[PDB]
Amino acid sequence: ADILPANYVVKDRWKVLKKIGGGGFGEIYEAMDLLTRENVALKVESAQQPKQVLKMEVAVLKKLQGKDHVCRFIGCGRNEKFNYVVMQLQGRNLADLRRSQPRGTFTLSTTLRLGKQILESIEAIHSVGFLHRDIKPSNFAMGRLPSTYRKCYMLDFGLARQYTNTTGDVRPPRNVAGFRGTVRYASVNAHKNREMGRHDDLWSLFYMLVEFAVGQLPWRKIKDKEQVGMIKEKYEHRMLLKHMPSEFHLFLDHIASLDYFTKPDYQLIMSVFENSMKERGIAENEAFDWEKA
Ligand SMILES: CC(C)(O)C#Cc1ccc2[nH]c3c(c2c1)-c1nc(N)ncc1CCC3
């Protein structure tokens, strides 16, 4: 029931090696580029699929070309059986890398430097008029080249939504919007089925970095969406920072001040990470936790 069988060739050029990801809305393959001779990521959507989402993912990926933390766009197309996009192949995701660490915790020096890169990628997608709406560790992957192995890449625009109109204006929010993303790193706004904003992507970043540094979130054992929302709604969030750098209280306070309409202060949040590093003498050139160094 896979859309492409192994050794299937797309457009006489990309040869399927194996499936590397799957879900309701399509599949991702590692393929060999019979022209450039590197391997690539080949993401496919069944032609017959009711909700056609790939066309928007490709539009977002093309808008982001030239930005750091973005896969290179190789090709796309359309035929009677499937839509596809070919993109740069990336490596290990941050969820797998976090689980591989002894206590499921990154050093502050890894956490803060990933934070800078993820924040850059969030501002980037926001700058072309889209919300990601499923910011989570498994959607960020480290590079797999000498030129990219300390670079973090933003994946999966499958749940993204344009928050501007044709003419650059902020769109009206729907009075109710069904939150369809991952429970653990969802904002209290998303839990309430409110229209998501730029601030909700930065809430997801906040929860990710607490989990990175501390090794857990208070609700991690609870999978039910409506229970997790009720736990978050009451949780004293300044408790989450007990063992985090104090400069995180600026980040929390800022994103708590934001609504759907307000452009976030990305530079305020960047300065939290940069001041946290400077305080501790963390350098940018440091080993990540998962490297031999
Ligand atoms: C078109 C766009 C940007 O929206 C997308 C997307 C995308 C969704 C789901 C995915 N699952 C995986 C990947 C992936 C990508 C993946 N992608 C890449 N390029 N390298 C490596 C991997 C790791 C293997 C698993």
Numbering used by the authors: 21 to 313
Provide the publication's sentences verbatim.
Tau tubulin kinase 1 and 2 (TTBK1/2) are understudied serine/threonine/tyrosine kinases that belong to the casein kinase 1 superfamily. Their kinase domains have 88% identity, 96% similarity, and the same catalytic residues: lysine 63 and aspartic acid 164 (TTBK1) and lysine 50 and aspartic acid 141 (TTBK2). As their names imply, TTBK1/2 are reported to phosphorylate tubulin and tau at multiple serine residues. We have described the design, synthesis, and biological evaluation of a series of indolyl pyrimidinamines as chemical tools to interrogate the functions of TTBK1/2.
Our lead (AMG28) emerged from examination of the off-target activity of a published Amgen NF-κB inducing kinase (NIK) inhibitor. The potency of AMG28 was reported in the MRC Kinase Profiling Inhibitor Database as 8% activity remaining for TTBK1 and 12% activity remaining for TTBK2 when screened at 1 μM. Biogen evaluated AMG28 in a biochemical assay (TTBK1 IC50 = 199 nM) and a cellular assay that measures inhibition of tau phosphorylation at Ser422 (IC50 = 1.85 μM). The aminopyrimidine ring makes two key hydrogen bonds with TTBK1 backbone hinge residues Q108 and Q110. Except for AMG28, which was equipotent on both kinases, all analogs were more potent inhibitors of TTBK2 than TTBK1. We propose that the ring system size alters the orientation and trajectory of the alkyne and the ability of the compounds to make key contacts with the back pocket is diminished with analogs 1 and 2 compared to AMG28. All inhibitors, including AMG28, that protrude into the back pocket produce remarkably higher Tm shift values than TTBK inhibitors that are unable to access the back pocket, including those built upon the AZ2 scaffold (ΔTm < 3.5), when tested in parallel.
